[PDB]
Design a protein around this nucleic acid. Structure first.
Ligand code: EZM
Ligand code: K
Ligand code: MG
Ligand code: MG
Ligand code: MG
Ligand code: MG
Ligand code: MG
Ligand code: MG
Ligand code: MG
Ligand code: MG
Ligand code: MG
Ligand code: MG
Ligand code: MG
Ligand code: MG
Ligand code: MG
Ligand code: MG
Ligand code: MG
Ligand code: MG
Ligand code: MG
Ligand code: MG
Ligand code: MG
Ligand code: MG
Ligand code: MG
Ligand code: MG
Ligand code: MG
Ligand code: MG
Ligand code: MG
Ligand code: MG
Ligand code: MG
Ligand code: MG
Ligand code: MG
Ligand code: MG
Ligand code: MG
Ligand code: MG
Ligand code: MG
Ligand code: MG
Ligand code: MG
Ligand code: MG
Ligand code: MG
Ligand code: MG
Ligand code: MG
Ligand code: MG
Ligand code: MG
Ligand code: MG
Ligand code: MG
Ligand code: MG
Ligand code: MG
Ligand code: MG
Ligand code: MG
Ligand code: MG
Ligand code: MG
Ligand code: MG
Ligand code: MG
Ligand code: MG
Ligand code: MG
Ligand code: MG
Ligand code: MG
Ligand code: MG
Ligand code: MG
Ligand code: MG
Ligand code: MG
Ligand code: MG
Ligand code: MG
Ligand code: MG
Ligand code: MG
Ligand code: MG
Ligand code: MG
Ligand code: MG
Ligand code: MG
Ligand code: MG
Ligand code: MG
Ligand code: MG
Ligand code: MG
Ligand code: MG
Ligand code: MG
Ligand code: MG
Ligand code: MG
Ligand code: MG
Ligand code: MG
Ligand code: MG
Ligand code: MG
Ligand code: MG
Ligand code: MG
Ligand code: MG
Ligand code: MG
Ligand code: MG
Ligand code: MG
Ligand code: MG
Ligand code: MG
Ligand code: MG
Ligand code: MG
Ligand code: MG
Ligand code: MG
Ligand code: MG
Ligand code: MG
Ligand code: MG
Ligand code: MG
Ligand code: MG
Ligand code: MG
Ligand code: MG
Ligand code: MG
Ligand code: MG
Ligand code: MG
Ligand code: MG
Ligand code: MG
Ligand code: MG
Ligand code: MG
Ligand code: MG
Ligand code: MG
Ligand code: MG
Ligand code: MG
Ligand code: MG
Ligand code: MG
Ligand code: MG
Ligand code: MG
Ligand code: MG
Ligand code: MG
Ligand code: MG
Ligand code: MG
Ligand code: MG
Ligand code: MG
Ligand code: MG
Ligand code: MG
Ligand code: MG
Ligand code: MG
Ligand code: MG
Ligand code: MG
Ligand code: MG
Ligand code: MG
Ligand code: MG
Ligand code: MG
Ligand code: MG
Ligand code: MG
Ligand code: MG
Ligand code: MG
Ligand code: MG
Ligand code: MG
Ligand code: MG
Ligand code: MG
Ligand code: MG
Ligand code: MG
Ligand code: MG
Ligand code: MG
Ligand code: MG
Ligand code: MG
Ligand code: MG
Ligand code: MG
Ligand code: MG
Ligand code: MG
Ligand code: MG
Ligand code: MG
Ligand code: MG
Ligand code: MG
Ligand code: MG
Ligand code: MG
Ligand code: MG
Ligand code: MG
Ligand code: MG
Ligand code: MG
Ligand code: MG
Ligand code: MG
Ligand code: MG
Ligand code: MG
Ligand code: MG
Ligand code: MG
Ligand code: MG
Ligand code: MG
Ligand code: MG
Ligand code: MG
Ligand code: MG
Ligand code: MG
Ligand code: MG
Ligand code: MG
Ligand code: MG
Ligand code: MG
Ligand code: MG
Ligand code: MG
Ligand code: MG
Ligand code: MG
Ligand code: MG
Ligand code: MG
Ligand code: MG
Ligand code: MG
Ligand code: MG
Ligand code: MG
Ligand code: MG
Ligand code: MG
Ligand code: MG
Ligand code: MG
Ligand code: MG
Ligand code: MG
Ligand code: MG
Ligand code: MG
Ligand code: MG
Ligand code: MG
Ligand code: MG
Ligand code: MG
Ligand code: MG
Ligand code: MG
Ligand code: MG
Ligand code: MG
Ligand code: MG
Ligand code: MG
Ligand code: MG
Ligand code: MG
Ligand code: MG
Ligand code: MG
Ligand code: MG
Ligand code: MG
Ligand code: MG
Ligand code: MG
Ligand code: MG
Ligand code: MG
Ligand code: MG
Ligand code: MG
Ligand code: MG
Ligand code: MG
Ligand code: MG
Ligand code: MG
Ligand code: MG
Ligand code: MG
Ligand code: MG
Ligand code: MG
Ligand code: MG
Ligand code: MG
Ligand code: MG
Ligand code: MG
Ligand code: MG
Ligand code: MG
Ligand code: MG
Ligand code: MG
Ligand code: MG
Ligand code: MG
Ligand code: MG
Ligand code: MG
Ligand code: MG
Ligand code: MG
Ligand code: MG
Ligand code: MG
Ligand code: MG
Ligand code: MG
Ligand code: MG
Ligand code: MG
Ligand code: MG
Ligand code: MG
Ligand code: MG
Ligand code: MG
Ligand code: MG
Ligand code: MG
Ligand code: MG
Ligand code: MG
Ligand code: MG
Ligand code: MG
Ligand code: MG
Ligand code: MG
Ligand code: MG
Ligand code: MG
Ligand code: MG
Lengths: 275, 48
RNA sequence: GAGCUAGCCCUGGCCAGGGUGAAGCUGGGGUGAGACCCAGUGGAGGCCCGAACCGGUGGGGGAUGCAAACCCCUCGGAUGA
RNA sequence: GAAUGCCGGCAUGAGUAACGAUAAAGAGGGUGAGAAUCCCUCUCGCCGUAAGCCCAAGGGUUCCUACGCAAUGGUCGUCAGCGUAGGGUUAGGCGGGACCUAAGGUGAAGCCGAAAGGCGUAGCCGAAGGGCAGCCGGUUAAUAUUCCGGCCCUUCCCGCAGGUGCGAUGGGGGGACGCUCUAGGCUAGGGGGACCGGAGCCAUGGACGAGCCCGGCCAGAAGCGCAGGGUGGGAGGUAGGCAAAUCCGCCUCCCAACAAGCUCUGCGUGGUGGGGAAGCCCGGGUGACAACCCCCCGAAGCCAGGGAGCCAAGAAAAGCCUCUAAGCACAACCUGCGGGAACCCGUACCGCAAACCGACACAGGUGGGCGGGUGCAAGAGCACUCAGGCGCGCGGGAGAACCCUCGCCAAGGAACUCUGCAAGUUGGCCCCGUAACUUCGGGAGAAGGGGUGCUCCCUGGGGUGAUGAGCCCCGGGGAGCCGCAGUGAACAGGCUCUGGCGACUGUUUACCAAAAACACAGCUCUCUGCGAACUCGUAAGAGGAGGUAUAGGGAGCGACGCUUGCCCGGUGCCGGAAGGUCAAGGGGAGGGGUGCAAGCCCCGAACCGAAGCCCCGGUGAACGGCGGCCGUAACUAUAACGGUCCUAAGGUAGCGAAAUUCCUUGUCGGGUAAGUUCCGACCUGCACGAAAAGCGUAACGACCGGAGCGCUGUCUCGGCGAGGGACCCGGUGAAAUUGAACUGGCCGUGAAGAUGCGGCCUACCCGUGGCAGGACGAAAAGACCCCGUGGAGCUUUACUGCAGCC
RNA sequence: CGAUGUCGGCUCGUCGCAUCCUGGGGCUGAAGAAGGUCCCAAGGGUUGGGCUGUUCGCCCAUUAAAGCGGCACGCGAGCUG
RNA sequence: UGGGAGAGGGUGGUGGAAUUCCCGGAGUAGCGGUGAAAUGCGCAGAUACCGGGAGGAACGCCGAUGGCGAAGGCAGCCACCUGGUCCACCCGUGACGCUGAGGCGCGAAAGCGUGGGGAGCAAACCGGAUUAGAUACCCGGGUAGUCCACGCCCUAAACG
RNA sequence: CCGAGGGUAGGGCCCGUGACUGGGGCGAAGUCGUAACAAGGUAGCUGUACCGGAAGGUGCGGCUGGAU
């Protein structure tokens, strides 16, 4: 449940915050944080290449274990669930009976004190990781690799999941969070369950200040600019778009498909996203 | 009001100094040209 | 040429005093259990009043100026984008 | 001789403006050729969260002393931040380096680029961040945590003794972190003392006093005490921490546990060393054998890596500790002690300013720390004042107009004016009380009112002591006293009713616009499956993101509430393996040049041959669009109804003379004595209308309208007064402008607005204070307007290319 | 066009007369009082408010009357804006 | 105390039929629909047939004039949690009862808020017909919604 | 001191009135269509929702007070 406020300011009237109930430890594991180099949206030339970024709260990056096939057979106990500022999902600290400590993103339903393990032989329970070929058709799954041994790429955000849909040759068929139907290699690792913190999308930011805390600088409409700045610029008084709506750079932005047509992965995509 | 010259020795040496000029094609041309003209100072005087 | 100015990055610093009194917590009341109500505690907030600080609303002055943008009165923000 | 020519020189304006904050001066004495201006004394005023003191930038000798006054100084000058000369800056502990890393920069390996060059994990550089050993006092004309004195401390080298598996650029721990609130105990700092020390004072009516005035501390190893920070101990297993490990991590067992213990810091004390006022006296001596004590207040500072809560979740690396590997184990390291060794650069002076940035000794700008006392509820606010520093580098008179800043005003009270513009009013605190409406927070300091000083008497709770006195904090009740007036001075909202626009706090045209514009949470469309889309780059490489569709990009709309209709013919986008058109290339019927020939060479039809376009569909919170005419109802009037032309389809709900309405001050109603504005209605809407959103909406606004109450010099309508100028005298002394000038009025004339021509009129010569009608006055080669086959920004279904993409 | 500042107001006036009032007259469909219309006459006078930037105009309350024009649609080195 | 019947309620799981869509094969001149038609779909390969897949909703026979609930209402199958009610024994308590202004709770469908879901159906809407006209009835499309969670709404020919 | 009442200020209830606007009743001599009563020519009624010149229509669920 997101948390609401009494309207004792104009902004507290709509502001809602995460309840943080599943959180059991309020300090990151020191050996697993490193400094997160803030960019301001600027590249190695110094140039802005993603507009309207910077000025958000300082953050340390927590090293997340996105392989897990790294330690087949070695079980671990779920020691804590923690806040992670660099992603929407919560994160879970794992104490391996190995003595090694690692983070994973916290699935829905994970419990502090439970055990998890990875491998072709792992029980099909929440938090365990197996290659896709050994997960029963129909179970919902997250942190899915896209190619073997390259790391978990799909379904990593709060509340998201992919579902196994069938098998064909060396490949399995997944319904991605976006609704797309895609072939993924069967040797790719996934973790059974959906990602946690599903109430993330119900959060009402409430005021301009919160966007600023998050590093999101104010966005300014093309229509508010001049012709040197934007296709939508200029006009005496307000103006409709008076041309197909376009980006700052001139390409159209209401329907114009932008995926590269001759792409090799097309052979592995079955049905484009829905909705 | 606050004017445009706000002297700063570290800023001066690092921006116009001999070593900044020599690091760069255009900067070596500055030194070449000021030497050809007979300038007494090739680079701004800054105390360090 | 970014020692002015604009944005960002790293690292430091600053914001007198006063006012309002959110959640939560405790006690009481209530109920089959609750919702909830009352009191105390509590100390939230792009909350309020107001210096430093940051501004520059209205008027007056200045106009070969004290000043190539200043001065007086008044006025805006002042834990926050 | 002219180019608003160029360089220089010199005029005019003119003894004119001005001499740079309205904090302020007067006198005596001295110096000297010369004194309002230098030195000294007394008196007066001004700052005192500074206009005082320290630090960092920046400046670079401006510091100190002597001797000077041509120039510099807005006057003067004997003086000075000026001229000349001499002197002056002293560190193992302060700052930086011989330490560490941050962004960023550089860059072995590597990658890329016509050249130049671009990048790049490690490493290196890089600080006002981490780390690291000095406190008090004295001394000079001028430096002082640097010299000296006292008491302390760090590293390196060597040696001695004891102890130990010693050993690292490798492993681990630690270093190591936010915001807001905040406990205990201290310290800095402050107030009082009837107590301790002190030179003296008794005035002018009184006081020889529990009188006045002055002061009553600072640093300090070990030890001790008080208050806090940090940290569990033992064993067994071990597959992880890229080798090893006894360390760390994980599992288990035992003892311990809000304790103690060990450890570390702060504060107190502490051998010892220092300081020490007023006043008197010529910076110095005396005071003085100075005293050096008690009580209260008390930090934002310290203990500190303390505690709580919250979400936006809060650097690195080295020092340090531990672990082991090669090695090495007569070494090496650790502990104690002793002797020796300890380099480089900075240090003067200014530093909210006359020494820095502003051409100036410029009312401007400049980061950090200290910043006393009393009263006003508090406070860094306000008034006064301490320490300390100043009176702002032209003065002396006068007492006009006018200007500026300021004070008051009879009667009226917005009649002023575009507008109450401006200025009044209100004004702090305590108490009483407080409406519509509302998103239940608010609106709210609503509005409106009462109290406010001082004296006596009684009385309640707290802090510190001890539970008491003393001190300090918050109160309560009764009786009285004075004035016009008690937040008696200073600092301190005028209020209400009602519309428009924007939800709101914010942002903006540095230097004419602060707004209704931008932003904003929120709503929708759309793109993107990750080597993402998209962005920058020739590329490599980067951002996106060490993110992964609850995510990232683009677009519009803009809290919230109730909503968001019809048209897909055009354009856009999306889908469509048919068909039409379609380039290179393939193909090679047929034709041609040449050769005696084999041959060589050229043209070339059918057929095959992509994207794109055509074509078929879909698509509006995609670009956009959303009619006309004739007729009909018991009086008139109108038209629910019918007919007809056109269209892709003919504007729905809601709203409407509106931030939109031309006619227009539409009509009606309200308010006013009177209302082109305002509010409420009507609807023939020139020319509203649904995310270039439509209609509302509590709260908010230095936004823009309309009204009223209060109160006023805004006004009737002006008067008086104050100070700084203006004026006069002494000192210094500009400026734009200027064809030359011996430069009047009228009526005419003249290139059509004449001092300059004609006629007439008027007029002795030259200034000073004033006013602005003219000199088509000054300033700026008109920013409007046109012209130029002038230029630039911007647009697109103008032309023609290019990038990018297919 | 190497510049002649442009609406309205305020302030300050001055002039014309085709006279709004006051003074002198003729005619009248002038009984009186009150008017109408023309002639002479520029000496003086010619109000305060509501609306609107307004000039103008409408309206309120008065008045002997609430005149109309010129002066670069008088007057920004006089002010406003 | 001992027994019974039941779509009583809540949570989770899970089964097969059909519809629609997508893919593969096979095949060709229509399909669909009505009173009769047309719009629509179809040589860009429809309909009809076979194989595979996805997804939502509702549960055929049993089924009945049946059963349960206080009413609204409840229907594949399984399990867990839970309500009411009937029966026989006549064992226990000893009038502990009836009703019930106010109150509280429940309350079909439609509708609302925030998420999800979306096959079929289908207000609004669009088109075809019918008709004098036809903002309807009939036909072809079609969005809310119908479904799940939580919170509202509190109505009814909520009837016997 | 209390005090009729007067004054300043802000609230509550009631009555009358108001540009204009909403529907209602009645009139009857009109215009449009024909929704209900027969299966009333689409069985009716119904709560609710959306819509249409108008009676009304449709969707969802409900009743029989439905002809055959
Ligand atoms: N600062 C110089 C004066 C120029 C500005 C002035 N308004 C102006 O335009 N003056 C020019 C004369 O040079 C002229 O009088 C003029 C004045 C006004 C108009 N006008 O149309 O209102 C046109 C012409
Ligand atoms: K001109
Ligand atoms: Mg939760
Ligand atoms: Mg809230
Ligand atoms: Mg709250
Ligand atoms: Mg709440
Ligand atoms: Mg509020
Ligand atoms: Mg919360
Ligand atoms: Mg959580
Ligand atoms: Mg933390
Ligand atoms: Mg680290
Ligand atoms: Mg990182
Ligand atoms: Mg870089
Ligand atoms: Mg660069
Ligand atoms: Mg950016
Ligand atoms: Mg997280
Ligand atoms: Mg969240
Ligand atoms: Mg949101
Ligand atoms: Mg953030
Ligand atoms: Mg955004
Ligand atoms: Mg924007
Ligand atoms: Mg613009
Ligand atoms: Mg540009
Ligand atoms: Mg362009
Ligand atoms: Mg453009
Ligand atoms: Mg445009
Ligand atoms: Mg525009
Ligand atoms: Mg614009
Ligand atoms: Mg426009
Ligand atoms: Mg706009
Ligand atoms: Mg336009
Ligand atoms: Mg257009
Ligand atoms: Mg792939
Ligand atoms: Mg300059
Ligand atoms: Mg300089
Ligand atoms: Mg520097
Ligand atoms: Mg520096
Ligand atoms: Mg610098
Ligand atoms: Mg350099
Ligand atoms: Mg030389
Ligand atoms: Mg030179
Ligand atoms: Mg140079
Ligand atoms: Mg800068
Ligand atoms: Mg920092
Ligand atoms: Mg600092
Ligand atoms: Mg503050
Ligand atoms: Mg709590
Ligand atoms: Mg604020
Ligand atoms: Mg605030
Ligand atoms: Mg405030
Ligand atoms: Mg600023
Ligand atoms: Mg101003
Ligand atoms: Mg003013
Ligand atoms: Mg004034
Ligand atoms: Mg002025
Ligand atoms: Mg100026
Ligand atoms: Mg000023
Ligand atoms: Mg001022
Ligand atoms: Mg304030
Ligand atoms: Mg404050
Ligand atoms: Mg505040
Ligand atoms: Mg000549
Ligand atoms: Mg000249
Ligand atoms: Mg000249
Ligand atoms: Mg010249
Ligand atoms: Mg010249
Ligand atoms: Mg001369
Ligand atoms: Mg001269
Ligand atoms: Mg003179
Ligand atoms: Mg003169
Ligand atoms: Mg002043
Ligand atoms: Mg003076
Ligand atoms: Mg002198
Ligand atoms: Mg002197
Ligand atoms: Mg003073
Ligand atoms: Mg003071
Ligand atoms: Mg200098
Ligand atoms: Mg010195
Ligand atoms: Mg000197
Ligand atoms: Mg001199
Ligand atoms: Mg001299
Ligand atoms: Mg001289
Ligand atoms: Mg000067
Ligand atoms: Mg001399
Ligand atoms: Mg000397
Ligand atoms: Mg020393
Ligand atoms: Mg120093
Ligand atoms: Mg060395
Ligand atoms: Mg380094
Ligand atoms: Mg490089
Ligand atoms: Mg440093
Ligand atoms: Mg040091
Ligand atoms: Mg010491
Ligand atoms: Mg050994
Ligand atoms: Mg060892
Ligand atoms: Mg950290
Ligand atoms: Mg830090
Ligand atoms: Mg903050
Ligand atoms: Mg005190
Ligand atoms: Mg002391
Ligand atoms: Mg203590
Ligand atoms: Mg001590
Ligand atoms: Mg002494
Ligand atoms: Mg002595
Ligand atoms: Mg003695
Ligand atoms: Mg504080
Ligand atoms: Mg959060
Ligand atoms: Mg690092
Ligand atoms: Mg040892
Ligand atoms: Mg050396
Ligand atoms: Mg040195
Ligand atoms: Mg020094
Ligand atoms: Mg000085
Ligand atoms: Mg200052
Ligand atoms: Mg100077
Ligand atoms: Mg001066
Ligand atoms: Mg100055
Ligand atoms: Mg002090
Ligand atoms: Mg006060
Ligand atoms: Mg006060
Ligand atoms: Mg103040
Ligand atoms: Mg003075
Ligand atoms: Mg005089
Ligand atoms: Mg003054
Ligand atoms: Mg007086
Ligand atoms: Mg008066
Ligand atoms: Mg009045
Ligand atoms: Mg009055
Ligand atoms: Mg007004
Ligand atoms: Mg006042
Ligand atoms: Mg009211
Ligand atoms: Mg309320
Ligand atoms: Mg009041
Ligand atoms: Mg109000
Ligand atoms: Mg008194
Ligand atoms: Mg004052
Ligand atoms: Mg006051
Ligand atoms: Mg106030
Ligand atoms: Mg006022
Ligand atoms: Mg109001
Ligand atoms: Mg209006
Ligand atoms: Mg509005
Ligand atoms: Mg705005
Ligand atoms: Mg606003
Ligand atoms: Mg709003
Ligand atoms: Mg706003
Ligand atoms: Mg603010
Ligand atoms: Mg501006
Ligand atoms: Mg400007
Ligand atoms: Mg400018
Ligand atoms: Mg400008
Ligand atoms: Mg201005
Ligand atoms: Mg502005
Ligand atoms: Mg503003
Ligand atoms: Mg905006
Ligand atoms: Mg909205
Ligand atoms: Mg590019
Ligand atoms: Mg490119
Ligand atoms: Mg790259
Ligand atoms: Mg990246
Ligand atoms: Mg990255
Ligand atoms: Mg991402
Ligand atoms: Mg906006
Ligand atoms: Mg907008
Ligand atoms: Mg409302
Ligand atoms: Mg329509
Ligand atoms: Mg269309
Ligand atoms: Mg179409
Ligand atoms: Mg189209
Ligand atoms: Mg169509
Ligand atoms: Mg177009
Ligand atoms: Mg297409
Ligand atoms: Mg083609
Ligand atoms: Mg839509
Ligand atoms: Mg069109
Ligand atoms: Mg459009
Ligand atoms: Mg008629
Ligand atoms: Mg229209
Ligand atoms: Mg209208
Ligand atoms: Mg309107
Ligand atoms: Mg209009
Ligand atoms: Mg027009
Ligand atoms: Mg018309
Ligand atoms: Mg109009
Ligand atoms: Mg008009
Ligand atoms: Mg009228
Ligand atoms: Mg008005
Ligand atoms: Mg107006
Ligand atoms: Mg009309
Ligand atoms: Mg509009
Ligand atoms: Mg727009
Ligand atoms: Mg608009
Ligand atoms: Mg629109
Ligand atoms: Mg405003
Ligand atoms: Mg006056
Ligand atoms: Mg006076
Ligand atoms: Mg005077
Ligand atoms: Mg005076
Ligand atoms: Mg005077
Ligand atoms: Mg002459
Ligand atoms: Mg003439
Ligand atoms: Mg002559
Ligand atoms: Mg002549
Ligand atoms: Mg003549
Ligand atoms: Mg004459
Ligand atoms: Mg003149
Ligand atoms: Mg003139
Ligand atoms: Mg003349
Ligand atoms: Mg002139
Ligand atoms: Mg000029
Ligand atoms: Mg020129
Ligand atoms: Mg010209
Ligand atoms: Mg021109
Ligand atoms: Mg010009
Ligand atoms: Mg211009
Ligand atoms: Mg022209
Ligand atoms: Mg041409
Ligand atoms: Mg030509
Ligand atoms: Mg051009
Ligand atoms: Mg593109
Ligand atoms: Mg000229
Ligand atoms: Mg008569
Ligand atoms: Mg008569
Ligand atoms: Mg006559
Ligand atoms: Mg006259
Ligand atoms: Mg006259
Ligand atoms: Mg008028
Ligand atoms: Mg008019
Ligand atoms: Mg009229
Ligand atoms: Mg004219
Ligand atoms: Mg005219
Ligand atoms: Mg004129
Ligand atoms: Mg006029
Ligand atoms: Mg004029
Ligand atoms: Mg002017
Ligand atoms: Mg004017
Ligand atoms: Mg002039
Ligand atoms: Mg003039
Ligand atoms: Mg003139
Ligand atoms: Mg075919
Ligand atoms: Mg059946
Ligand atoms: Mg009952
Ligand atoms: Mg219900
Ligand atoms: Mg809805
Ligand atoms: Mg659908
Ligand atoms: Mg019809
Ligand atoms: Mg709808
Ligand atoms: Mg809806
Ligand atoms: Mg529904
Ligand atoms: Mg029923
Ligand atoms: Mg029934
Ligand atoms: Mg009376
Ligand atoms: Mg009928
Ligand atoms: Mg019928
Ligand atoms: Mg309708
Ligand atoms: Mg009709
Ligand atoms: Mg219908
Ligand atoms: Mg019947």
């Amino acid at each position: 449940a997101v948390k609401k406020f009494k309207p004792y300011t104009p902004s507290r009237r709509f502001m809602t915050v995460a309840d943080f109930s599943e959180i059991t430890k309020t300090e990151p594991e020191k050996s697993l944080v490193k400094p997160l180099k803030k960019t301001g949206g600027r590249n190695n030339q110094g140039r802005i290449t993603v507009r309207f970024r910077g000025g958000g709260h300082k953050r340390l990056y927590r090293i997340i274990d996105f392989k897990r096939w790294d330690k087949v057979g070695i079980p671990a106990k779920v020691a804590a669930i923690e806040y992670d500022p660099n992603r929407s999902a919560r994160i879970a600290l794992l104490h391996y009976v190995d003595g090694e400590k690692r983070y994973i993103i916290a699935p829905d339903g994970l419990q502090v004190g439970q055990q998890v393990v990875a491998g072709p032989d792992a029980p099909i329970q929440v938090g365990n990781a197996l290659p896709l070929r050994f997960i029963p058709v129909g179970t919902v799954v997250h942190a899915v690799e896209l190619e073997p041994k390259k790391g978990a790429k799909l379904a990593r955000a709060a509340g998201t999941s992919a579902q196994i849909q069938g098998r064909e040759g060396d490949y399995v068929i997944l319904r991605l969070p976006s609704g797309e139907l895609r072939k993924v290699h069967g040797e790719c690792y996934a973790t059974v369950g959906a990602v946690g913190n599903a109430d993330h999308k119900n959060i009402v930011l409430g005021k301009a200040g919160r966007s600023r805390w998050l590093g999101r600088r104010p966005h300014v409409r093309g229509a508010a600019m001049n012709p040197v700045d934007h296709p939508h610029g200029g006009g005496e008084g307000r103006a409709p778009r008076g041309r197909p709506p376009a980006s700052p750079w001139g390409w159209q932005t209401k329907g114009l498909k932008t995926r590269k047509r001759r792409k090799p992965s097309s052979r592995f995509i079955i049905a484009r996203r829905k909705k | 009001m606050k004017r445009t010259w706000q002297p700063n020795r570290r800023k001066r040496a690092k921006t116009h100094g001999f070593r900044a000029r020599m690091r760069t094609p255009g900067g070596r041309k500055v030194l070449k040209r000021r030497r050809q003209k007979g300038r007494w100072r090739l680079t701004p005087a800054v105390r360090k």
